[PDB]
Ligand binder design. Structure first.
Ligand SMILES: OC[C@H]1O[C@@](CO)(O[C@H]2O[C@H](CO)[C@@H](O)[C@H](O)[C@H]2O)[C@@H](O)[C@@H]1O
Ligand SMILES: [Zn+2]
Ligand SMILES: [Zn+2]
Length: 369
């Protein structure tokens, strides 16, 4: 890491170009060059490189990955004063607190919502159970009912947790890493339904982010599941779409895992003062957030002043409604294991290489091993 400049990493799904614009205003005003990159699998890359003393000066990613980094001493403790802390909703601050210490700056809160084509389906389904019949019906027009990324468990987890599945129970003031619910009845029921949709051919196990996006933006599928970041391309496609509550399962709401996009500062960085200045005085301001938000919508931002101007947007109201029905992700070091195990379980169950029961049993065992 070079002293006198800022290198930032952020998930390619978000508005990295919008974040670069903020970096340019910073450079103009300060003279410091800000380089924004979106490396592949940055959440796994950062740990590796940061452990040797390099990597970016600032890393932007969902808060669930940060506990792992902090435990490894890869994050500098941020030092925001009371006046600044008061500018962001306190619940977003709790999302980046680890071991009684703040390890990152909250930027935005997001969750998945059901997105549907108003012209193909005026009244979206309130339940998962009615999608199969609805799909067959749309097949009589060469169209499908629902397409969404089945490769990443973040997308399928809302259904799995609906009837009772869960990661780590939060109890006694902390996350119980032995009390895991990926192999219970609730979780099995939800994944069995998903896998049935795939085997019965209402969905294809190969559907990924590209497939689902192209299908919905070309009006070939009535619905999709995605986050705020996808709204930009949908607007560009001209689809008359709506953003609403995820359907229910066995009479219960789908429970999406709520993520808080956070900016953490590399412990090995020689530009910690500059990082703080950029985040607190350039990014986390109405101006900075609007810049990023106009690139790719962030969802409900942590900045109270700006969030008030965004709250009006019904798409954001829908995001929050889904978020309140779900659960803020835990940020413990074991989350990496949870995601890896679940990602594998869903993939094997969906590809036939394993029965739902097997898949989940193995994920559960590996998560608590
Ligand atoms: O492709 C998944 C997409 O979802 C996010 C939402 O924050 O990641 C979440 O889900 C992953 C598994 O699907 C986890 O590995 C990750 O830690 C979690 O935040 C995005 O970051 C990601 O691009
Ligand atoms: Zn069917
Ligand atoms: Zn693919």
């Amino acid at each position: 890491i070079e002293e006198g400049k800022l290198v930032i990493w952020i998930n390619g799904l978000f508005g990295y170009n919008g974040l670069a614009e903020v970096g340019k205003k910073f450079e103009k005003d300060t003279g410091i060059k800000v380089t924004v990159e979106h490396p592949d699998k940055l959440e796994e890359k950062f740990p590796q490189v940061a452990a040797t003393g390099d990597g970016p000066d600032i890393i932007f990613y969902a808060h669930d990955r940060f506990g792992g980094y902090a435990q490894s001493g890869l994050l500098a403790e941020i030092t925001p004063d009371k006046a600044f802390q008061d500018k962001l909703y306190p619940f977003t601050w709790d999302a980046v607190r680890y071991n009684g210490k703040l390890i990152a700056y909250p930027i935005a809160v997001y969750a998945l919502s059901l997105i549907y084509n108003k012209d193909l389906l005026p009244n979206p389904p309130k339940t998962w159970e009615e999608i199969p019949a609805l799909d067959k019906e749309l097949k009589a027009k060469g169209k499908s009912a629902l397409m969404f990324n089945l490769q990443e468990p973040y997308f399928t987890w809302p259904l799995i947790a609906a009837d009772g599945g869960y990661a780590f129970k939060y109890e006694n003031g902390k996350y119980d890493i032995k009390d895991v619910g990926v192999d219970n009845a609730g979780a099995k029921a939800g994944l069995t339904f998903l896998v049935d949709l795939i085997k019965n051919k209402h969905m294809n196990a190969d559907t990924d982010y590209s497939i689902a996006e192209a299908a919905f933006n070309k009006g070939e599928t009535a619905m999709t599941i995605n986050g705020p970041w996808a709204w930009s391309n949908i607007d560009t496609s001209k689809v008359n779409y709506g953003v609403t509550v995820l359907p229910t399962f066995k009479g219960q709401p789908s429970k999406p895992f709520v993520g808080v996009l956070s900016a953490g500062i590399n412990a090995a960085s020689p530009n910690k003062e500059l990082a703080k200045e950029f985040l607190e005085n350039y990014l986390l301001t109405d101006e900075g957030l609007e810049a990023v938000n106009k690139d790719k919508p962030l969802g409900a931002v942590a900045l109270k002043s700006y969030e008030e101007e965004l709250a009006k947007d019904p798409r954001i109201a829908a995001t929050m409604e889904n978020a309140q029905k779900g659960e803020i992700m835990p940020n413990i070091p074991q989350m990496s294991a949870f995601w890896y195990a679940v990602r594998t379980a869903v993939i094997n169950a969906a590809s036939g290489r394993q029965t739902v029961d097997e898949a989940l049993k193995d994920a559960q065992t590996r998560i608590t091993k």
